[PDB]
Amino acid sequence: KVFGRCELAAAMKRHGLDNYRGYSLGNWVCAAKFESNFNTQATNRNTDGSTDYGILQINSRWWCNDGRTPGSRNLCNIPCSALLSSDITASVNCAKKIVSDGNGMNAWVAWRNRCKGTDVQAWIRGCRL
Ligand SMILES: [Cl-]
Ligand SMILES: [Cl-]
Ligand SMILES: [Cl-]
Ligand SMILES: [Cl-]
Ligand SMILES: [Cl-]
Ligand SMILES: [Cl-]
Ligand SMILES: [Cl-]
Ligand code: NA
Q: What's in the GO CC field?
């Protein structure tokens, strides 16, 4: 599913991301924009052989099982395919574990490079929330 910007903001709020670990909703919407362009089915293979999945491009090296990432962990205890659902529950639940891990949203390289420090509130401006 390709979410609309405000549609995803509403879904992320409903699922408890707004100010999760002190990160405002616009941070999460921004990270989803540049990670997946709001497409739940986005995938991208990394040079290390791991793959990133879903709206927040959660990686198979640590966080989910895809059966093809040697030496990897599955700390969210989910198949990576769960991260491609129209329903964002699995992605959100896993993202909350990732953002709790120590480096906050710096775990998402696109967030650090394209959202951090910017006027992220622009990403929710206009939306009925
Ligand atoms: Cl947009
Ligand atoms: Cl915000
Ligand atoms: Cl694996
Ligand atoms: Cl394969
Ligand atoms: Cl594990
Ligand atoms: Cl699995
Ligand atoms: Cl933090
Ligand atoms: Na894995």
A: cytoplasm; endoplasmic reticulum; extracellular space
